[PDB]
Design a protein around this ligand. Structure first.
Ligand code: PC1
Ligand code: PC1
Lengths: 114, 105, 347, 175, 70, 115, 80, 318, 98
């Protein structure tokens, strides 16, 4: 019957946030706080369009803003963040309870310097 | 004698489960939510005979969403062609399909 | 049987029938059918006799097979349709399996091999409850899915039911097997007209229920389960012979009695569809049913059989049994012809 | 022949069903159906139905432990047949296994059989989803909304089980 | 006297210590020094598959941090 | 997959012990060591006679109570539901139905034994 | 009613204890003060995604940032 | 490397079964004012080895009247079923992390009776038939109570996972809010494993040996090890359910030491219980569990249903 | 449709032919009936789990539940025969023919 109209592979070729699960979980609250606008724009247009072939620019902007946030994390508070995501990654269930000292140090550092 | 007392007393007994496109706990859609919505809203109140005679396309699309059998025939045809072309020997798989591909994230 | 437990059992079977009546879900339909099964089962075992156990085993096995066929039809309809609304079915094989399930539940031929033994092995009140209350829920289900019913299948089952019921009723001396084969014949007459006008099916079901309940009430009143005792009823009371004569004339199909009211109008809803030879064949088998009815009337009322000397004792005590609404149901079973258009209340 | 694990479990299901459908003796029929129910529960676990598979497992174990008690109580013959002590039991078992292998050979060859409906030869894993349901399982909220959404269903199920208790009490009274 | 059972039962203690401890030590080998990633729902499996797909060695336990991006 | 490996290893270890227990030692059988054990005398009939077992209703109602358990078992996840009042009312209702069945068994002389 | 209660406590204390626990479990949640706290605790668990809405310009309640004071807070469970 | 983990799970529990036989005979002698086995080895350390080799160099002695299929199938199935439910036990990290490990334990515990039934019916004798009937009655007694005990104890856990059961112990034991259910669970574990005073199958005074009275050496030892693995594992499960210890992710040695000591003490308590009381009749088994246990556990089940709603203490399912 | 659907429905009709052709024992037919219900349950659960219909997940187990609510009845319809006849052979069950 109908025909499908798929996007070209060049448009989908975009660099990625090549990190792990524990690194994403460690900076999850601050990423959700600072980067709310492009994420909410992407979520709204995906919910109201229901078509991933027309929902690429907002995903690109979400990815770019996430990588920018992680670059800003890398420039200022690298080593406390490394300690935080390391001790988060040691736990099997990725529990936020077993990382109170590292979380306190990380939030204090990122509040004092950013 | 279909005594529909569910509308006489206004009490909902089993209208919340009878249709795949109903209200679900924690708002989880099924695999054919949109097709169910189209098939209900196109064939509402006009009678079963007119619904079958006129709304056949969306019901066919819903049945294809559910059973997926035409996609099975498509996959069977391309896989038989692939097996044949490997068996005679004029086809080589790409490195992306073979496994060493380094996926997107 | 405990009266409170019996009342709970009766409320359970009526609740199951009501659940089948009012539900818009296939699972609730099957749940009501299972409740109907499980509540009618101890009704037959009120007397704790081996005949009752044999009848209960046969009934339970046949209705279990019907229930499993109904579940397979429901699952096929679900898989090809994705919902549960009680409406037209979306597969011919699901329609087949549900039609076989409902035919097994009703007792329609060639699945008639369980009704006469089940009726014979149980008392008269249990037979009344069976042959009246078990013919409401499957009729409602067939009323719901009549768009998807195959015409040839239901018509073949109907004509087989009427022919087999007449030929069975020609050669039975027991009253309950006569009732069972008459019920098969009425079932075929009632389900032959289902696809043309289901209001005719409902009207014939109502008239058949009224007449069968009237006859079972008269049998309970006379406490007779054999043809010879039914003949012996003439000495106990003449009025009982008058009512059995007029009622068994009514179920024969004679005017101006009420039993001519449904069947004739069945033809009135089958000549409009230009089906001519089928109502003629069903009228011929109705004449066969009238023949065994006429033999029974010759046995009971029109000829007074010799009696015994013990019945004089029975002349000194009036009938203290409770005849539940007997004159009203007899009048409705006899003289309902001049109120023929009242079937329009069933639309 | 690796990703046909659902196919292999279904074949063991049909094999056990043919095995206990010969009706040799209630204990051996229970054993055959229990093997069949084990591989059916394996099917349901392999499709993500942990709760439903374990529930059908536990229910069948209880029910035919009761069936074992009943056949060792009343319905016993002097010399029960295993599978080969009688002729028609072995005949229908071999017959059912032969038809089972018949459509096995029919479905592994042309990949499309036509028995009533049409049937394909690929595994069912192709229809399984590519999406993720988050921090939860959907069937768990099905059986959780059993109590909240399911009002009439739970009411009639409980009433039917109570009626089953009172009926089973009433039947085996004798007087 | 009574304390003479205290040798033999102690052996059973070792027989109740060797299995479970070994599992923990096995969990400190195949997972590269960390615990085994306990997957309970679809999102935990999706995150573990994300680590597997980003590590480039097809091992989920090789966790790469913020030094991976530039 | 790991469950299948554990099952196969357990079955392999189980069936290896009986094979070691059977085909390793020397067998020497006559027609008295294979005889059924009846405390040193011949058996009276066979053991395939129907037992006049007395707790048939207890086994059937064990089945029914296990199905009551099957209704009552998904209760913990229902603790996460929003409509808490209907949850609590109907969990109490189903437990009360179980208790009603048990009380009717108690009063109508069902928990005792026949003969 | 004291004599009957003493009689059943002397004959079978298990039935008396079971009926006391059943009556307590029936009548106490209807007198509980924390049931509505359980209601909002269950209702406040963020299972699915909180998708935003389109803007026509006229909404005083919903915020544009998660840290804005407008919108519902969760201070009652934090203190408790 | 799952094979090494499986082997190190399944072999030392068999060694634990053997040394459980050792300390069983020793302690059971010791409350009877006599010494235990101490002649064969130093303090009798070589008694289980002699017992194990002795049973495996005897004659299997298959009966003629016994149906050989279930006769050879019952003990292997018993040993496998006693072995196959050890996996969901957190020790502190379980072998297989199943979300519904409680249901797996319940279903494999329901399967464990089938070896007893098949061994009773396969051997053609009256004593085996009576033992099978008593085992059926024992299952009738214990299942409908044990399921409700486990559900009502588990209602504060929040989910069926045994891994999250170690999280709930971090503040207090669940034996403090569920001590009556702890008593019910201990009597149920007494009843299920077929240990005195709830043995009723391997009776010495009532029957000769019951379900395995026709079972000679070799096949007989499998039932012995299956029952002893069952009681050790059941006591470990009770320890995890009610007396869970302090878990530290950086040092599993603490939790292994603690639950090993607690389960060993509970098994010693089981040995203490099993030889101080007369054996119950099996007609009083369901004159107690169907009469006294069931209404009490129904009341406690509805109490534990209505309690987190009362105190606003709904546990998380994750 | 698929393959496992074919296997399950063929198991159902195999158990149906097992029930519909008796072999002189009632409880064996009861076992075949419970096998037909096993095929029904397996088919329904697989159909739901393929179609992601969460809210209908109550229907299989409840179906299962109701089957036991009749299956024990069949067992309750066995011993009564054993309370009249010595055995439970169906060829002895022919008293209802007159
Ligand atoms: C916990 C682990 C337990 C593992 C199993 C137990 C450990 C020991 C295993 C080996 C035990 C000895 C062999 C089996 C038992 C034999 C008993 C016996 O008396 O046999 C006599 C028999 C000889 O007696 P026979 O053949 O004359 O038969 C005696 C019976 N009559 C005379 C009536 C017919 O020994 C054998 O048949 C030899 C068996 C193999 C011996 C080793 C061969 C070389 C192996 C390298
Ligand atoms: C798991 C942790 C460790 C547990 C303890 C382990 C060590 C101790 C073991 C002791 C020996 C156990 C085995 C031998 C006994 C086996 C038989 C047996 O147990 O029979 C059960 C016995 C049998 O009783 P019986 O044998 O006396 O029966 C006689 C019955 N009448 C009187 C009718 C004739 O008891 C029960 O069935 C009762 C169940 C347990 C009761 C628990 C009550 C808890 C508190 C409830 C509330 C109380 C306050 C009042 C109400 C308040 C309301 C707000």
């Amino acid at each position: 019957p109908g025909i499908v109209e798929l996007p070209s592979l060049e448009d989908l070729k975009v660099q990625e946030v090549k990190v792990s699960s524990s690194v994403l979980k460690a900076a999850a609250h601050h990423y959700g706080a600072q980067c709310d606008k492009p994420n909410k724009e992407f979520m709204l247009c995906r919910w109201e369009e229901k078509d991933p072939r027309r929902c690429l620019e907002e995903g690109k902007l979400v990815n770019q803003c996430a990588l920018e946030f992680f670059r800003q994390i890398k420039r200022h508070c690298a080593e406390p963040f490394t300690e935080y995501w390391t001790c988060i990654d040691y736990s099997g269930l990725q529990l936020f309870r077993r990382c109170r000292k590292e979380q306190a140090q990380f939030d204090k550092c990122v509040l004092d310097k950013l | 004698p279909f005594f529909d007392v569910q509308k006489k007393l206004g009490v909902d007994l089993d209208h919340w489960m009878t249709i795949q496109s109903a209200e679900q706990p924690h708002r989880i859609p099924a695999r054919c939510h949109a097709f169910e919505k189209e098939w209900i809203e196109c064939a509402h109140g006009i009678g079963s005979i007119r619904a079958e005679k006129e709304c056949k396309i969306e019901f066919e699309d819903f049945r294809e969403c559910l059973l997926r059998q035409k996609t099975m025939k498509r996959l069977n045809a391309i896989k038989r062609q692939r097996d044949k072309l490997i068996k005679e020997g004029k086809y080589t798989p790409p490195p992306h399909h073979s496994g060493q591909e380094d996926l997107r994230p | 049987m405990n009266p409170i437990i019996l009342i709970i059992i009766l409320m359970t079977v009526m609740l199951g029938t009501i659940i089948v009546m009012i539900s818009t879900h296939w699972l609730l339909i099957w749940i009501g059918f299972e409740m109907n099964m499980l509540a009618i089962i101890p009704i037959m075992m009120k007397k704790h006799n081996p005949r009752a156990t044999e009848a209960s085993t046969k009934y339970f096995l046949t209705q279990s097979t019907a229930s499993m066929l109904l579940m397979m039809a429901i699952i096929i309809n679900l898989m090809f349709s994705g919902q549960w609304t009680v409406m037209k079915l979306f597969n011919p094989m699901a329609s087949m399996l549900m039609t076989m399930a409902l035919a097994m539940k009703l007792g329609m031929a060639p699945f008639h091999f369980w009704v006469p033994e089940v009726t014979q092995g149980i008392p008269l009140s249990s037979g009344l409850i069976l042959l009246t209350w078990q013919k409401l829920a499957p009729m409602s289900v067939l009323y719901q899915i009549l768009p998807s019913i195959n015409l040839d299948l239901i018509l073949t089952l109907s004509i087989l039911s009427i022919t087999i019921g007449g030929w069975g009723g020609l050669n039975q001396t027991q009253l309950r097997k006569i009732m069972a084969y008459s019920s098969i014949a009425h079932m075929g007459w009632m389900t032959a007209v289902l696809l043309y006008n289901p209001t005719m099916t409902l009207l014939n079901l109502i008239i058949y229920i009224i007449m069968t309940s009237t006859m079972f009430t008269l049998f309970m009143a006379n406490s007779t389960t054999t043809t010879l005792s039914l003949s012996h009823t003439w000495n106990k009371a003449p009025i009982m012979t008058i009512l059995v004569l007029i009622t068994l004339l009514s179920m024969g199909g004679l005017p101006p009695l009420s039993g001519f009211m449904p069947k004739w109008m069945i033809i009135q809803e089958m000549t409009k569809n230009d089906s001519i030879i089928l109502p003629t064949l069903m009228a011929i088998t109705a004449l066969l049913n009238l023949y065994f009815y006429m033999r029974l009337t010759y046995s009971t009322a029109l000829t007074m059989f010799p009696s015994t000397n013990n019945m004089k004792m029975k002349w000194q005590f009036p009938t203290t049994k409770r005849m539940t609404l007997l004159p009203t149901m007899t009048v409705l079973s006899t003289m309902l012809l001049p109120l023929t258009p009242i079937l329009s209340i069933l639309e | 022949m690796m990703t046909y694990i659902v196919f292999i479990l279904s074949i063991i299901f049909v094999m056990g069903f043919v095995g206990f459908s010969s009706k040799p003796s209630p204990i051996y029929g229970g054993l055959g159906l229990i093997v069949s129910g084990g591989v059916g529960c394996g099917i349901v676990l392999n499709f993500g139905g942990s709760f439903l598979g374990l529930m059908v497992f536990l229910i069948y174990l209880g029910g035919m432990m009761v069936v074992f008690g009943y056949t060792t109580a009343m319905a016993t013959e002097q010399y029960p047949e295993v599978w080969v002590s009688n002729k028609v039991v072995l005949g229908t078992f071999i017959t059912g296994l032969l038809m089972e292998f018949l459509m096995v050979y029919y479905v592994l060859k042309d990949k499309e059989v036509e028995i009533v409906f049409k049937f394909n030869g690929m595994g069912d894993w192709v229809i399984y989803d590519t999406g993720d349901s988050g921090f939860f399982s959907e069937e768990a909220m099905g059986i959780a909304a059993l109590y909240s959404y399911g009002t009439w269903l739970v009411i009639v199920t409980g009433w039917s089980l109570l009626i089953g208790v009172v009926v089973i009490m009433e039947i085996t009274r004798g007087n | 006297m009574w304390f003479e059972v205290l040798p033999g039962i102690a052996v059973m203690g070792v027989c109740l210590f060797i299995p479970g401890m070994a599992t923990a030590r096995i969990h400190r080998f195949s997972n590269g020094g960390r615990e085994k990633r306990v997957a309970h729902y679809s999102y935990q499996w999706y995150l573990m598959e994300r680590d597997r797909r980003v590590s480039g060695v097809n091992r989920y336990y090789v966790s790469k941090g913020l030094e991976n991006i530039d | 997959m790991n469950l299948m490996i554990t099952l196969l290893t357990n079955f392999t270890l189980a069936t290896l012990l009986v094979t070691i227990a059977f085909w390793l030692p020397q067998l020497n059988v006559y027609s008295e060591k294979t005889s059924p054990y009846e405390c040193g005398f011949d058996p009276m009939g066979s053991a395939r006679l129907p037992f006049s077992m007395k707790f048939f209703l207890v086994a059937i109602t064990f089945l029914l109570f296990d199905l009551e358990i099957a209704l009552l078992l998904p209760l913990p996840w229902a603790s996460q539901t929003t409509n808490l009042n209907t949850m609590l009312t109907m969990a109490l209702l189903l437990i009360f139905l179980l208790a009603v069945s048990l009380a009717y068994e108690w009063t109508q002389k069902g928990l005792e034994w026949t003969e | 009613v004291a004599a009957f209660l003493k009689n059943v406590w002397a004959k079978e204390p298990v039935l008396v204890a079971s009926f006391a626990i059943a009556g307590l479990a029936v009548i106490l949640p209807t007198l509980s003060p924390y049931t509505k706290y359980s209601l909002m605790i269950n209702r406040a668990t963020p299972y699915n995604y909180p998708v935003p809405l389109r803007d026509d310009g006229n909404m005083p309640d919903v915020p544009s940032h998660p840290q804005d004071p407008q919108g519902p807070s969760l201070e009652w469970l934090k203190r408790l | 490397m799952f094979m090494i983990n499986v082997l190190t799970l399944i072999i030392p529990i068999l060694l634990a079964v053997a040394f459980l036989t050792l300390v069983e005979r020793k302690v059971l002698g010791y409350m009877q004012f006599r010494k235990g086995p101490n002649v064969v080895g130093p303090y009798g350390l070589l008694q289980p080895i002699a017992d194990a080799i002795k049973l495996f160099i005897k004659e299997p002695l298959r009966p003629a009247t016994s149906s050989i299929s279930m006769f050879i199938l019952a003990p292997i199935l018993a040993l496998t079923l006693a072995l196959t439910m050890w996996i969901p036990l957190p020790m502190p990290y379980p072998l297989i992390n199943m979300n519904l490990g409680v249901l797996f334990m319940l279903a494999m515990s329901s399967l464990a009776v089938y070896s007893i039934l098949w061994s009773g019916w396969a051997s053609n004798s009256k004593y085996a038939l009576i033992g099978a009937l008593r085992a059926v009655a024992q299952t009738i007694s214990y299942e409908v109570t044990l399921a409700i005990i486990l559900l009502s104890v588990l209602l504060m856990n929040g989910s069926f996972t045994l891994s999250t059961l170690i999280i709930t112990q971090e503040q207090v034991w669940l034996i403090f809010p569920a001590w009556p259910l702890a008593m019910m669970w201990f009597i149920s574990t007494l009843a299920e494993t077929n240990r005195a005073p709830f043995d009723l199958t391997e009776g010495e005074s009532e029957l000769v040996s019951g379900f395995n009275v026709e079972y000679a050496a070799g096949p007989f030892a499998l039932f012995f090890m299956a029952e002893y693995a069952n009681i050790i594992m059941m006591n470990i499960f009770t320890t995890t359910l009610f007396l869970g210890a302090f878990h530290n992710p950086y040092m599993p040695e603490l939790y292994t030491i603690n639950f090993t000591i607690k389960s060993l003490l509970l098994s010693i308590t089981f040995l203490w219980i099993r030889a101080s009381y007369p054996r119950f009749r099996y007609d009083q088994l369901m004159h107690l569990l169907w009469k006294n246990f069931l209404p009490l556990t129904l009341a406690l089940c509805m109490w534990h249903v209505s309690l987190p709603i009362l105190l606003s203490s709904i546990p998380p399912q994750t | 449709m698929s393959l496992v659907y074919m296997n399950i429905m063929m198991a159902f009709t195999v158990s149906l032919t097992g029930l519909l052709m008796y072999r002189s024992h009632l409880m064996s037919s009861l076992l075949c009936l419970e096998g037909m219900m096993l095929s029904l349950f397996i088919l329904a659960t697989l159909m739901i789990l393929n179609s992601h219909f969460t809210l209908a997940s109550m229907m299989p187990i409840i179906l299962l539940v109701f089957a036991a609510c009749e299956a024990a009845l069949g067992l309750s319809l066995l011993v009564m025969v054993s309370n009249t006849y010595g055995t439970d052979y169906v060829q002895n069950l022919n008293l209802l023919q007159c």
